[PDB]
Amino acid sequence: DVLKSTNSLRINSKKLGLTPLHVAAYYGQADTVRELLTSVPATVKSETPTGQSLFGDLGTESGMTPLHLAAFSGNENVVRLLLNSAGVQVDAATIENGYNPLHLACFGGHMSVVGLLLSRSAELLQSQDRNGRTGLHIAAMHGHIQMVEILLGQGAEINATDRNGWTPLHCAAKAGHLEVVKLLCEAGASPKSETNYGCAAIWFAASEGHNEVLRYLMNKEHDTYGLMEDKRFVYNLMVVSKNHNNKPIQEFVLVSPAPVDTAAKLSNIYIVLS
């Protein structure tokens, strides 16, 4: 109030491009947010942060309204206030990074905000970002399990591509969250699903460590003869088999429909790549 006598109360650019209503919406307390709704026009879509931003994984976000940050830090009462304010804008909610506040709820667990937003909007399950990702992609690749359970509970298309053709099982496999892959495989997505360079799930599960995701996806269905011609997949399978007592290379032989062809031909691919 005393600073409300003088200041314009929506200022910050130096070291953080935002407003005090972003900070008040971020850390909780809600009646302060109400007074700032009576003083500030309540939806400003702030700025680019300068130097050093907050928010962890969001190293830079350009144009986050304070509904996003209350959706982000968890702030469920502040979510309930900002969903009942003058400028709500739950649908459009555009950032230069491309996100929507459901996705910003997916960056944490924050399942209460997911219940509030999916209860409120419900045209947001299929909302894609600027990179084409949905909320199931982000909840997959950050490994929040029950968040994925709720996001299938409201009902989302699991086999849904990005602009590069990523299914969320590709993102879950690349991040290597095993139980997310068990959830998406056990009730959904096909492992035989390419990308816009020509890939699968086991190419990402082999390209970055993750023996157990590789054995789970390797127990599923996949085209081996398309995989052995990808020399990078063969090399990364060698690398993972080096670390994990060469069980997974044995698994890639013994799963294939002709194991002797795969062992022999793939051994020749090894000797040629030598």
Partner 1 sequence: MISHMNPTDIQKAMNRQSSVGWTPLLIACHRGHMELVNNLLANHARVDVFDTEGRSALHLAAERGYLHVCDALLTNKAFINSKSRVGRTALHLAAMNGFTHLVKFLIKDHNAVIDILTLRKQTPLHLAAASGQMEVCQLLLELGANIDATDDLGQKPIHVAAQNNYSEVAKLFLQQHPSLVN
The answer to whether 201 touches 171, Cβ cutoff 8 Å, is no
115 touches partner 1 (CB under 8 A): yes
If you ran DSSP here, which 8-state letter would residue 197 be given?
Answer: T
126 touches partner 1 (CB under 8 A): no
229 touches partner 1 (CB under 8 A): no
* Tokens read off for 46: 């702030």
81 touches partner 1 (CB under 8 A): yes
119 touches partner 1 (CB under 8 A): yes
From the CB of 192, what's the least distance to partner 1, in Å?
29
Which range touches partner 1 (CB under 8 A), out of 52-60, 62-70, 78-86, 236-244? 78-86
Could you give the CA distance from residue 176 to residue 204 in angstroms, rounded to a whole number? 9
From the CB of 159, what's the least distance to partner 1, in Å?
21
34 touches partner 1 (CB under 8 A): yes
Among 10, 80, 220, 244, binds partner 1 (CB under 8 A): 80
- Sequential DSSP letters for 212-259: HHHHHHHHS---HHHHTT-HHHHHHHHHHHHHTTTHHHHHHHHHSSSH
Can you tell me which residue has the tokens 């209503």? 21
- Sequential DSSP letters for 94-126: --SS---HHHHHHTS--HHHHHHHHHHT-S-TT
Which range touches partner 1 (CB under 8 A), out of 45-53, 73-81, 136-144, 226-234? 73-81
* Tokens read off for 193: 């699903």
Among 50, 91, 122, 192, binds partner 1 (CB under 8 A): 122
62 touches partner 1 (CB under 8 A): no
Residues that bind partner 1 (CB under 8 A): 31, 34, 77, 80-81, 84, 115, 119-120, 122
